[PDB]
């Protein structure tokens, strides 16, 4: 008998999870801190936007001792993701990623981060739920929920399974109570699939190019004025179906490049980048 353990996942993934420090100008002091994940040998690192927002200088530290000045290659407010880059030769530890792995509810997971700057720490839990909207009332975003313990400092860090395969990027824990009780074990992470998709976008366009039509809300109509990009070939208030050769839907509209002529029925519009 050997002790039950997730050290395999730790050996495989921990080396690539780094400590991130958002240093601002008062001279140069630590404004916030968090964690990040080294995605590849090129030096790209994922983390949370809020962790580096308004930083004057971003420092990345690896568990092997190396420290680096980091370049902000991009960030996205919707998914609260951000990509950094470190010019490191000599080789960088990388995070195991299996694009074919489907995370399942109940899967054992480990959160890797730097809570209260105590140093890198691994906590254990399971995938509690999938495709969630976190705290936000309702946003075009879906997190993984986990009871692996995360604290201030875990933000931007890795959520891996027992094999060390990146499952997600930890973001925040559930905030307040309904009546004086502190919620326990409710944390969120961005699915590694969406994080990988947003990274590549941030690396290519310096940011996320989303295709915004011109209406707010199946059915279309708003409690507030509509945008100028709605007078291309559609009506006031009604429902729609086939848009650009596809039966009716949200994410598809944003995945379309701005300027393009899109055929909208119930006949062509031009997508305008999300303002």
């Amino acid at each position: 008998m050997t002790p039950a353990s997730y050290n395999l996942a730790v050996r495989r993934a921990a080396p690539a999870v780094v400590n991130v420090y958002n240093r601002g100008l008062n001279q140069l002091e630590i404004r916030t801190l968090g964690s990040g994940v080294i995605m590849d040998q090129r030096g790209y690192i994922i983390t949370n936007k809020h962790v580096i927002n308004d930083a004057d200088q971003i420092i990345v530290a690896l568990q092997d001792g190396r420290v680096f000045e980091a370049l902000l290659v991009g960030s996205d407010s919707l998914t609260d993701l951000a990509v950094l880059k470190i010019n490191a030769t000599g080789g960088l530890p990388t995070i195991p990623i299996n694009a074919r792995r489907v995370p399942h509810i109940g899967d054992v997971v480990l959160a890797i981060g730097n809570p209260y700057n105590l140093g890198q720490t691994i906590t254990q839990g399971i995938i509690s739920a999938t495709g969630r909207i976190g705290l936000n009332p309702t946003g075009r975003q879906n997190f993984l929920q986990t009871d692996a313990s995360i604290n201030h400092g875990n933000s931007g860090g890795a959520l891996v399974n027992s094999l060390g395969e990146l499952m997600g990027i930890n973001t925040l824990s559930f905030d307040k109570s309904n009546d004086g009780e502190t919620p326990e074990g409710i944390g969120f992470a961005i699915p590694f699939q969406l994080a990988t998709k947003i990274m590549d976008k941030l690396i290519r366009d310096g940011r996320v190019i989303r295709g915004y039509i011109g209406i707010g809300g199946i059915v279309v109509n708003e409690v507030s004025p509509d945008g100028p990009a709605a007078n291309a070939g559609i009506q006031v208030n009604d429902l729609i179906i086939s848009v650009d050769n596809k039966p009716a839907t949200m994410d598809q509209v944003a995945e379309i490049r701005p300027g393009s002529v899109i055929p909208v029925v119930v006949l062509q519009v031009t997508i305008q980048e999300y303002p």
């Binding site: 009332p137 309702t138 075009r140 915004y212 039509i213 011109g214 209406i215 707010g216 809300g217 949200m250 509209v253 944003a254 999300y274």
Partner: peptide
């Protein structure tokens, strides 16, 4: 709410 919707943001298309």
């Amino acid at each position: 709410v919707y943001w298309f």
